[PDB]
Design a binder for this molecule. Structure first.
Ligand code: CA
Ligand code: CA
Ligand code: CA
Ligand code: NA
Length: 399
């Protein structure tokens, strides 16, 4: 079976004030990301997932994701002195051969990256368009919606199967399998506390505190196996009306999901894990023990390490609640820290920090998350209704 690959994952090496030219190449094997322009070129029509994560320092940041010269998605994060922030966004977009996609500052150019600080930008082909009707059928169930009881997202980035109901805010599973979900909320005016529901219960929680003159960005993502007829949605969670979700002409709060691996009987290549902290050790892997998904057992709870058992391209994402103390983590691959994520903590201001990257892995490769340096910046937080999560999945197996 031919595998359709087109993916890139890059980072800033310099912060600069125009398309943002990422020049740190995590992955770009098809060479479909052009480093001299910062633009991704579509060579294969289909449904593409894009995600970015920016270190906010010194000055506010506002960026927009462009698809062939139109602003599709906006992400705003205000900076306060002595308070480094983390802003992210993600969305599905269907692309035609020729479409180009990039990121630029919507000044608010507070993007930052140096020798131990990353701002990254990643995209991959999820579903290629199935010529009429050639080769491998593709199982599709996906949605990507934005804000304009379940939270009713009405702005439609993608809903081609209509498995998401815009009048109720609910996604309905029509195809049994492993689903990925992600959200990104701009926090303004009031605190934001949300919860990802599955059927009838809160699976995941994300809290982000709002201080005056400090718009924030909060995100979450998880892997959930679904059976036909059960649904998923995002609901404001708490008892203090933590509903400071925001959106306007050029500010988004989004909710995205997609079938990753469909269920089969006796071939699909599956290697995935999604785990969370159940509370809060220097120079050692952070051990996430709450298990959302770990079907192949490729993630080892007892060591906190992911082991590659199928060579190919992997996507990793994490989301961390920042409380009481600065948080800085490094993503390791095979005893080398690949990616760094820093988020300062200010009193009475819980924060949300995240990163995600594509990494090609071979047999023996281990991936894990570790607190940075001497392990001092360990303000990671989790409890009965606050999450810090680590997720990874096999995207394309080597052929
Ligand atoms: Ca912060
Ligand atoms: Ca902020
Ligand atoms: Ca906050
Ligand atoms: Na944040």
């Amino acid at each position: 079976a031919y595998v359709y690959r087109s993916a890139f994952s890059v980072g800033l090496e310099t912060y600069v004030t125009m398309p943002i030219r990422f020049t740190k190449i995590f992955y770009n094997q098809q060479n479909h990301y052009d480093g001299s322009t910062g633009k991704f070129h579509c060579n294969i029509p289909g449904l593409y997932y894009f995600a970015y994560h920016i270190t906010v320092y010194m000055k506010d940041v506002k960026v927009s994701l462009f698809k062939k010269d139109k602003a599709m998605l906006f992400t705003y994060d205000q900076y306060q002195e002595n308070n480094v922030d983390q802003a992210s966004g993600s969305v599905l977009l269907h692309l035609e051969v020729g479409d180009q996609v990039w990121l630029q500052v919507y000044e608010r150019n507070g993007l930052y990256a140096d020798n131990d600080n990353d701002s990254t930008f990643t995209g991959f082909l999820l579903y290629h368009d199935t010529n009429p009707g050639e080769g491998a059928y593709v199982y599709r169930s996906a949605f990507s919606v934005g804000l304009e009881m379940p939270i009713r997202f009405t702005k439609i980035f993608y809903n081609q199967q209509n498995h998401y109901d815009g009048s109720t805010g609910k996604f309905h599973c029509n195809i049994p399998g492993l689903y990925y979900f992600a959200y990104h909320i701009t926090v303004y005016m009031k605190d934001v506390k949300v919860s990802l529901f599955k059927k009838d219960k809160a699976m995941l929680f994300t809290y982000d505190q709002y201080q005056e003159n400090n718009v924030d960005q909060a995100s979450g993502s998880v892997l959930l196996h679904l059976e036909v007829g059960d649904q998923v949605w995002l609901q404001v969670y708490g008892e203090g009306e933590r509903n400071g979700l925001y959106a306007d002409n050029d500010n988004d709060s989004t909710f995205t999901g997609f079938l990753l691996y469909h269920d089969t009987n006796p071939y699909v290549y599956r290697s995935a894990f999604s785990v969370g902290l159940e509370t809060y050790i220097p120079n050692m892997p952070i051990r996430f023990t709450k298990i959302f998904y770990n079907q192949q057992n490729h993630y080892d709870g007892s060591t906190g390490k992911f082991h590659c058992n199928i060579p190919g391209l992997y996507y990793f994402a994490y989301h961390i609640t920042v409380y009481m103390k600065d948080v800085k983590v490094s993503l390791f691959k095979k005893d080398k820290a690949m990616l760094f994520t820093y988020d300062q903590y200010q009193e009475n201001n819980v924060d949300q920090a995240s990163g995600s990257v594509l990494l090609h892995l071979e047999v023996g490769d281990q991936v894990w998350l570790q607190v940075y340096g001497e392990g001092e910046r360990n303000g990671l937080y989790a409890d009965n209704d606050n999450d810090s999560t680590f997720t990874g999945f096999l995207l394309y197996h080597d052929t």
